[PDB]
Design a protein around this ligand. Structure first.
Ligand code: SF4
Ligand code: SF4
Ligand code: SF4
Ligand code: SF4
Ligand code: FES
Ligand SMILES: [Ca+2]
Lengths: 208, 586, 905
């Protein structure tokens, strides 16, 4: 129920294989402590592409307060950032810039596609748009929407936190196994199918 | 006579003046639904006509638009000169409150026009875009390089034989050699951009990743110490191909793409497109539709102005009004979600009306917003806008007069801070804006950053007044016109009448058939003047969709106004323009 | 003639009515009850315009443009307020009883009534009362019936009865309860009943075979193609969705098959969607069937073909010109054998010699309708070349047409034409072994064996011209009928002689050639039409080669140790046991085919070829016109494992791998140029269609409409990433909507008809130069040969009369439009329409054998005893037994053969 990824510099320059979860009880507790610290302090790269970035900085404001999750520092440097939110369209002139900024980020790093443009190109199936940011960089969380509302971005933040909290990474670069192990978690569609199909009645659209 | 009727405008005094000056056989008058006199001028007389219009007793002082059209696939070209391509020039005389559209016909092999930059400096970027997207060469241009697409691009995207969709092309593969080659193309070289370089002129790179809400873009700066001796903006990093999608989507299905032209505008962006399509369809919307569209336009205008003022204050250095202004944006978003069901891109305007009726309880939410807003605005002024540090950062920074605003096509608050009282809602009224009592604020004559910001505050207050008038006087009636081309028809008649079901079936599947004509609508957007110029060839898709945006003009006006200033002055000027890069590139 | 429409002057034809003249000018007038092929009746009252007496007139009067001639100096208005109001009122009256059915209607998005409701501007309903309803009928497996949607425009009855000559469809009832259908539930008996799905402007008659896997018109990927189910070569528009051939529409060709197809072409396409088709190359290794891709298939096939001492190739008339030529280049000209029998090849080459050397013009399918007398010798036209039978019916009604023309009645006023010419008709004389479907309009029918039909033709030619060989032994009654035929044919300005190779007799073709030569020698404008068997029978005959029997002897003698069979099952052209033994003896059998045939069990290699829906190519129809068919869809778009290529691509890659050990596939224009360079008789196929570099102002031609949907969801279950659009390097069409399909585009190949405001098949009016005429820039297709300057000589081989010998039964051929074709029986929707396999017997022969109707009798052919039930055929001559050709187990080469020990089982 895990995937093993090791990188060695077409993009992405990684190869993944399905592997059994390896997990002493002290090493496991240290791994959960490291994962807890990584998931409760996630610093996003302040990267503005399009309208989805306007919704992201709406999520950062007072009526939403994304600071409650410890994800508010909003670094302008990719070295100091933990999370790349592709919040906008992957234009062909901007795609090498996105690749360069993602390369300049440091491990551990995670990617959230925010919006239909970053997911698959969205409505812009046009000559000057890369059809999704997963064509050239690996994505951890996808948010459908055009735009997603700010609480959808927070929901993806919680999904990323839950994905980090059960993934395995080396504690030190001199001791252990240096490959990155990511959990193959259950899809949210199959998890929410029980509560979504049973919905019967909704409020009529003629009211407030 | 309805306002959508086809007119040749032979009663315009400019037509008689051109008859007396150049002769009757020199040009062809075209009857359109654009509302403007369209004159097909021969190519060798184009600069003469431009000089004559610039030297009129009430001169045509502003080049509103300049672009091209591929006429090869156009079947209904009756009463028109023979052409494979054409170049159109939209020129505005503010003193007459009139405008004229010159058109130059071009063959497929001889695709060269004399340049228009000696008369209007905005023709630089307009002709660069026309060369980039249509391949039309302009003789005498200082630098005719691509402005939207990279320099290593093959073909011109807006030609009719160029495939539109990315799925037509190969999927995007990023290899090591491809990444190196595209990173080499984005590198700046002083000689190619016409910098015209002293052993001290350093070069500065601003973008293309941009820590602000208004898009991602580059500015390359030539510096003597800290002084900006020259600069040229690099745009096209936000190009979405929206006009090519206008040729690719039907009339009804293009409205979501019209939403994302200026993504802080929403229904303000939807308004000129649906007005131009209703001109093409011969649809006069009822008064309730006009009041609803005015109300939503003013709501989104207050949203955009709140974001602009908050972003300007944040760029000065005070970071709290962005939190409070986004709370006010959340109140506006509550009302907009209640009415349309979406926050930023409602796509709620329709050909002939709006998608739904107003929900029960809209007046309550509008009342809460109208009670909430003015105290918050006064707190914004007292906390940040009257701060002397903000005034020192803003007043006197990147200032220009009426002549520089007129020659560069600057509209909106930047034009009106020069003292020129020119708002579309009062000069060329649209969508029943003549029934609303509101004032147009103007400046003293100098367009500082602070003057533009205070003007946008004043238009926020006037939009609050318009919203109060909309709340007090909303007519009872239909939310959709009774025209046969109202797309889509009212939903319940579609659900129980077979003829209405047929109309809806054909309008949402194949599209509604607009008769072959040309239409034009310009509106006062949240950031200036936004216009749609729509050419229909009689089909269910647009033959040509031309979207004129003011942010293009303001980004082109940047090097003339920021020259000889500091880099922080450039940051303040960027924060005080009220642009977005989707508006620039689209 | 000069007309003035809305103040604008137009030059039109004064013989036309105002509706077709105004539609030819590009003006839009709504209409329901008028059809270009059917004429004007003035029923629906939808085409109303306002006519003025003179130029200075303001009142005017509402007239009907279909019923008003477009005479010189006419003044009309379409956009007049009263005319617009009346047209909207007519649409409203039609909409009072219409069901709320558009989402669940197969005509939705393809509906003429929808287009005319939108065009008239009627979108508000104020009728508040009830709507009339009708029960539906079961009209068979092909046509679905829904009478609630009818607007009582009488197009169906007019087409089916006046044009198609059918009998079982009619109008019943009264004032507003008019019902259109059969008198009782049952299958529609017309061979052209499938055209009702395009004739009906509503969804009353619908394609049930399409209604099974239904998709809308905007979701279809269309191509211009040629129907492969017989030799006529009707132009079709196959439309595909989700990797299966969904529908066949009539593609307008004003020279061939203008508005109408037959039922075999319209509903016999189901073999393409069979699940047992080969989709990958398969190699047999003992009991193992290894699936390969194309490269290792070519490598292995190249090694086994290079190790062989002599390779032979057996073509087929099913395959295109390019594929047969590629096989001929792979195996050599001397080692290339046509896949047909020796007798079939002899009849086909004689028909070709008559067509391109007899000095007599061969009419096109549309040109057949302008002939003054028709003699059909041997060919059951309705069951083999059905559209020729429809054109024969039109030529027969030409006498009523000219009788009405003699009374100054316009040619579009069809009711007056049919009233004047009540039952008078042009002479039609049909010969067969039994009754035909042309017997209701034939002046005479001769039910006789093929030798007797040939003798009748020879006697007709001798009586027309005494230089022709005479026939001795003609009965006085037969001589009187011959005199009647001769007196009819001699007095005809344009006689037409129709024969073919399906009769199984060389002497029938010789007699038809003699009749045509005798009519030509008298100065008449005689035309001759030969009906071949398969789609590219004429092309295979022009290319030539040995027969199937010679290839079988080459396999059996051991001189050929490798055989490549291209798209041929080989059991329809020879006995199955001999073919199986000869193929089992050969150490290498390679079958290049798109259908799972019976000889693939013995095949060492099977190449998954493409059908007409997945391939481009050229086919030569029965008149010698080369026609290019284009690929409809990429098979590998959905199933990425599917390796299914064109047959000429397979064989050219095989030839390249055999010669130089490298795999080069081809481009299609390279194969076309190779055909033109090597075979000068097939040099006309270059000009059949323009090459792959042809563009309309720089862009390609679109295969699918501009509102094509689902592009980011059609393949989303396989992969969420959108794949590369399929590239078409072979032709000028693209597998996308990013192309040109303008009605004014300078081209001849139209994949589908669509215009803004015209979503129905009435957009072909926008795609024509004048409505009902040709395509605007010429119809596609080019005749391979012109008429020769000098003709043939008289065939002196007059056969002896048919003598019924004891113990031997002459096999009289019976053809069926549903069942005789090789590929159409594979279509699962045909098995309900395919007849049961009987055998026909004379009453005297049945009484001599002591058998009744329905009992089973067994006969042995080539040492194979098979049993069949019996019908009693009254018209069948004694000494003959009637077998249905092309059926399950009955090969078409059995026609004209003899039978032994035919006795009751
Ligand atoms: S998904 Fe929609 S809201 Fe987000 S960047 Fe794209 S167009 Fe803007
Ligand atoms: S026949 Fe036409 S109008 Fe009637 S239900 Fe079908 S699509 Fe609708
Ligand atoms: S069934 Fe169809 S073709 Fe026949 S009268 Fe009714 S609408 Fe016309
Ligand atoms: S007549 Fe022959 S070619 Fe024409 S549709 Fe029928 S089967 Fe096809
Ligand atoms: S088309 Fe003329 S009345 Fe029907
Ligand atoms: Ca192909």
């Amino acid at each position: 129920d895990y995937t093993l990824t090791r990188i060695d510099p077409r993009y992405p320059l990684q190869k993944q294989e399905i592997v059994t979860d390896p997990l002493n009880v002290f090493m496991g507790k240290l791994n959960d402590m490291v994962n807890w610290g990584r998931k409760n302090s996630i610093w996003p790269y302040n990267f503005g592409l399009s309208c989805c970035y306007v919704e992201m900085v709406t999520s950062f404001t007072a009526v939403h307060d994304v600071a409650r999750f410890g994800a508010e520092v909003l670094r302008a440097s990719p070295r100091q950032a933990d999370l790349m939110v592709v919040a906008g369209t992957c234009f062909t002139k901007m795609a090498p810039v996105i690749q360069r900024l993602y390369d300049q980020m440091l491990e551990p790093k995670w990617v959230i596609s925010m919006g239909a443009c970053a997911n698959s190109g969205g409505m812009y199936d046009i000559y000057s748009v890369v059809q999704g940011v997963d064509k050239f960089i690996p994505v951890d969380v996808y948010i459908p929407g055009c735009p997603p509302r700010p609480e959808a971005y927070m929901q993806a933040l919680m999904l990323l936190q839950e994905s980090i909290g059960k993934e395995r990474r080396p504690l030190s670069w001199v001791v252990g196994d240096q490959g990155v192990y990511r959990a193959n978690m259950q899809s949210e569609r199959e998890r929410k199918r029980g509560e979504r199909i049973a919905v019967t009645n909704l409020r009529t659209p003629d009211e407030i | 006579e309805p306002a959508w009727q086809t007119r040749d405008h032979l009663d315009d005094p400019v037509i008689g003046e051109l008859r007396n000056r150049f002769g009757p056989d020199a040009f062809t008058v075209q009857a359109t639904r654009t509302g403007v006199p369209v004159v097909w001028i021969k190519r060798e007389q184009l600069l003469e006509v431009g000089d004559f219009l610039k030297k009129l007793p009430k001169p045509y002082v502003m080049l509103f638009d300049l672009h091209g059209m591929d006429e090869r696939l156009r079947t209904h070209r009756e009463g028109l000169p023979a052409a494979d391509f054409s170049v159109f020039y939209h020129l505005i005389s503010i003193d007459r409150n009139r405008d004229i559209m010159l058109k130059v016909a071009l063959a497929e092999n001889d695709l060269h026009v004399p340049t228009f930059t000696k008369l209007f400096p905005n023709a630089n970027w307009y002709e660069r875009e026309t060369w980039d997207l249509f391949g039309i060469t302009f003789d005498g241009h200082p630098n005719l390089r691509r402005i939207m697409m990279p320099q290593t691009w093959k073909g011109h995207p807006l030609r009719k034989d160029y495939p539109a969709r990315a799925t037509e092309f190969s999927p995007f593969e990023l290899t090591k050699a491809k990444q190196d080659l595209e990173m080499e193309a984005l590198t700046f070289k002083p000689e190619e951009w016409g910098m015209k370089r002293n052993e001290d002129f350093m070069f500065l790179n601003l973008g293309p990743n941009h820590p602000s809400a208004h898009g991602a873009f580059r500015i390359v700066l030539q510096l003597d110490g800290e002084e900006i001796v020259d600069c040229v903006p690099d745009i096209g990093y936000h190009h979405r191909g929206a006009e090519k999608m206008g040729e690719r989507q039907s009339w009804h299905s293009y409205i979501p793409y019209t939403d994302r032209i200026e993504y802080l505008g929403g229904c303000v962006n939807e308004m000129p497109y649906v007005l131009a399509v209703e001109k093409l369809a011969g649809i006069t919307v009822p008064d309730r539709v006009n009041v609803i569209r005015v109300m939503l336009s003013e709501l989104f205008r207050i949203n955009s102005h709140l974001l602009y003022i908050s972003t300007f204050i944040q760029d000065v250095g005070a970071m709290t009004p962005v939190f409070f202004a986004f709370t006010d944006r959340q109140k506006i978003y509550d009302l907009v979600e209640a009415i349309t069901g979406f926050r930023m891109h409602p796509a709620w305007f329709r050909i002939g009306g709006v998608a739904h009726d107003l929900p029960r309880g809209w007046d309550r939410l509008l009342r809460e917003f109208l009670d909430w807003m003015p105290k918050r605005l006064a707190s914004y002024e007292k906390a940040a806008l009257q701060n002397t540090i903000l005034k020192g950062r803003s007043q006197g920074v990147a200032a220009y007069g009426a002549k520089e605003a007129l020659e560069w096509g600057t509209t909106g608050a930047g034009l009106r801070a020069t003292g020129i009282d020119f708002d579309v809602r009062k000069a060329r009224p649209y969508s029943g804006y003549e029934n609303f009592d509101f004032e147009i604020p103007v400046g003293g004559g100098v367009s500082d950053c602070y003057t533009r910001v205070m003007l946008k505050v004043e238009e926020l207050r006037q939009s609050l007044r318009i919203l109060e008038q909309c709340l007090n006087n909303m007519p009872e009636g239909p939310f959709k016109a009774d025209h046969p081309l109202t797309t889509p028809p009212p939903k319940e008649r579609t659900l129980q009448h077979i003829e209405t079901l047929i109309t809806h079936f054909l309008q949402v599947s194949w599209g509604p058939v607009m008769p072959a004509n040309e239409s034009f609508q310009m509106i006062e957007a949240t950031k200036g003047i936004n216009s749609y110029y729509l050419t229909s060839d009689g089909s269910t898709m647009s033959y040509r969709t031309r979207i004129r945006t003011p942010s293009y003009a303001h980004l082109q006006q940047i090097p003339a106004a920021i020259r000889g200033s500091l880099v922080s002055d450039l940051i303040v000027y960027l924060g005080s323009i009220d642009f977005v890069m989707s508006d620039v590139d689209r | 003639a000069t007309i003035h429409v809305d103040g604008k002057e137009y030059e039109v034809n004064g013989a036309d009515n105002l509706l077709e003249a105004c539609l030819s000018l590009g003006l839009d007038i709504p209409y329901f009850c008028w059809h270009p092929a059917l004429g004007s009746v003035g029923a629906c009252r939808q085409c109303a315009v306002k006519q003025y007496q003179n130029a200075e007139d303001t009142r005017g009067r509402l007239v009907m443009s279909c019923m008003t001639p477009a005479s010189d100096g006419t003044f009309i208005s379409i956009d007049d307020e009263e005319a617009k109001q009346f047209r909207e009122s007519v649409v409203e009256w039609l909409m009072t009883n219409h069901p709320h059915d558009c989402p669940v209607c197969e005509e939705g998005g393809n509906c003429h009534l929808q287009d005319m409701t939108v065009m008239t501007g009627h979108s508000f309903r104020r009728y508040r009362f009830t709507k009339r309803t009708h029960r539906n009928q079961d009209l068979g497996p092909f046509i679905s019936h829904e009478m609630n949607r009818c607007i009582a425009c009488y197009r169906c009855v007019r087409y089916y009865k006046d044009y198609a000559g059918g009998t079982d469809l009619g109008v019943y009832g009264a004032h507003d309860n008019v019902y259109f259908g059969r008198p009782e539930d049952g299958t529609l008996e017309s061979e052209f009943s499938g055209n009702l799905v395009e004739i009906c402007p509503t969804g009353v008659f619908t394609d049930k075979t399409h209604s099974e896997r239904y998709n809308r018109k905007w979701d279809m990927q269309f191509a211009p193609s040629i129907c492969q189910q017989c030799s006529i070569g009707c132009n079709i528009s196959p439309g595909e969705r989700y990797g299966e051939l969904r529908r066949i529409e009539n593609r307008y060709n004003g020279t061939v098959n203008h508005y109408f197809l037959c039922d075999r072409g319209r509903f016999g396409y189901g073999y393409v969607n069979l699940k047992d088709r080969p989709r990958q190359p398969v190699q047999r290794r003992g009991d193992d069937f290894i699936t390969l891709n194309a490269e290792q298939a070519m490598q292995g096939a190249a090694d086994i073909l290079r190790q062989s001492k002599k390779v032979i190739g057996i073509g087929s008339p099913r395959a295109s010109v390019e594929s047969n030529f590629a096989l001929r280049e792979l195996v050599g000209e001397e080692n290339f054998y046509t896949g047909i029998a020796h007798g079939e090849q002899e009849r086909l080459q004689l028909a070709l010699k008559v067509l391109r050397e007899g000095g007599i013009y061969t009419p096109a399918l549309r040109e057949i309708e302008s002939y003054d007398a028709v003699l059909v010798l041997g060919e059951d036209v309705t069951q083999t070349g059905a559209r020729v039978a429809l054109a024969v019916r039109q030529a027969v009604k030409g006498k009523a047409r000219e009788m009405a023309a003699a009374q100054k009645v316009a040619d579009w006023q069809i009711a007056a034409i049919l009233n004047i010419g009540q039952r008078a008709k042009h002479p039609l004389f049909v010969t067969n072994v039994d009754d035909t479907r042309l017997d209701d309009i034939a002046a005479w029918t001769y039910r006789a064996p093929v030798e007797d039909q040939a003798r009748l033709g020879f006697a007709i030619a001798h009586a027309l011209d005494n230089s022709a060989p005479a026939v001795d032994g003609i009965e006085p009654e037969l001589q009187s009928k011959i005199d009647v035929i001769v007196q009819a044919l001699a007095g005809a300005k344009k006689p037409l002689i129709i024969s073919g190779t399906n009769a199984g007799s060389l002497e029938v073709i010789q007699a038809a050639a003699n009749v045509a030569k005798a009519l030509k020698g008298r100065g008449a404008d005689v035309g001759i039409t030969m009906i071949a068997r398969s789609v590219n029978s004429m092309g295979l005959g022009i290319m030539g080669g040995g027969s199937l029997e010679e290839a079988l002897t080459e396999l059996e003698t051991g001189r050929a140790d490798a055989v490549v069979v291209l798209e041929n099952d080989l059991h329809r052209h020879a006995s199955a046991t001999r073919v199986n033994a000869a193929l089992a003896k050969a150490p290498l059998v390679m079958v290049v085919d798109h259908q799972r045939t019976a000889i693939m069990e013995n095949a060492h290699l099977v190449l998954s070829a493409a059908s007409f829906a997945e391939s481009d190519g050229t086919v030569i129809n029965n008149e010698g016109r080369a026609q290019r068919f284009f690929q409809v869809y990429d098979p590998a778009y959905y199933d990425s494992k599917t390796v299914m290529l064109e047959s000429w691509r397979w064989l050219h890659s095989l030839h390249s791998t055999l010669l130089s050990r490298e795999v080069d596939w081809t481009q299609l224009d390279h194969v076309i140029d190779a055909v033109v360079a090597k075979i000068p008789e097939l040099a006309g196929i270059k000009d059949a269609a323009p090459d792959a570099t042809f563009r309309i102002r720089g862009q390609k031609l679109a295969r699918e409409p501009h509102r094509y949907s689902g592009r980011t969801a059609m393949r989303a279950n396989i992969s969420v990433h959108e794949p590369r659009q399929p590239q078409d390097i072979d032709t000028m069409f693209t597998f996308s909507m990013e192309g040109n399909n303008q009605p004014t585009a300078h081209r001849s190949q139209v994949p589908f008809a669509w215009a803004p405001g015209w979503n129905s098949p009435q957009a072909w009016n926008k795609f024509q130069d004048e409505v009902g005429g040709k395509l605007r820039f010429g119809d596609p297709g080019v005749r391979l040969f012109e008429t020769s300057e000098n003709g043939l000589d008289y065939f002196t081989s007059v056969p002896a009369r048919f003598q019924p010998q004891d113990g031997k039964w002459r096999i009289a051929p019976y053809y069926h439009l549903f069942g005789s074709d090789e590929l159409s029986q594979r279509a699962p929707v045909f098995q309900s329409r395919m007849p049961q396999p009987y055998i026909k017997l004379n009453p005297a022969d049945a009484a001599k054998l002591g058998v009744n109707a329905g009992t089973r009798v067994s006969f042995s052919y080539d040492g194979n005893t098979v049993t069949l039930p019996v019908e009693i055929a009254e018209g069948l001559t004694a000494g003959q037994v009637g077998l249905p050709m092309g059926m399950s187990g009955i090969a078409p080469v059995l026609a004209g053969a003899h039978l032994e020990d035919l006795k009751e089982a």
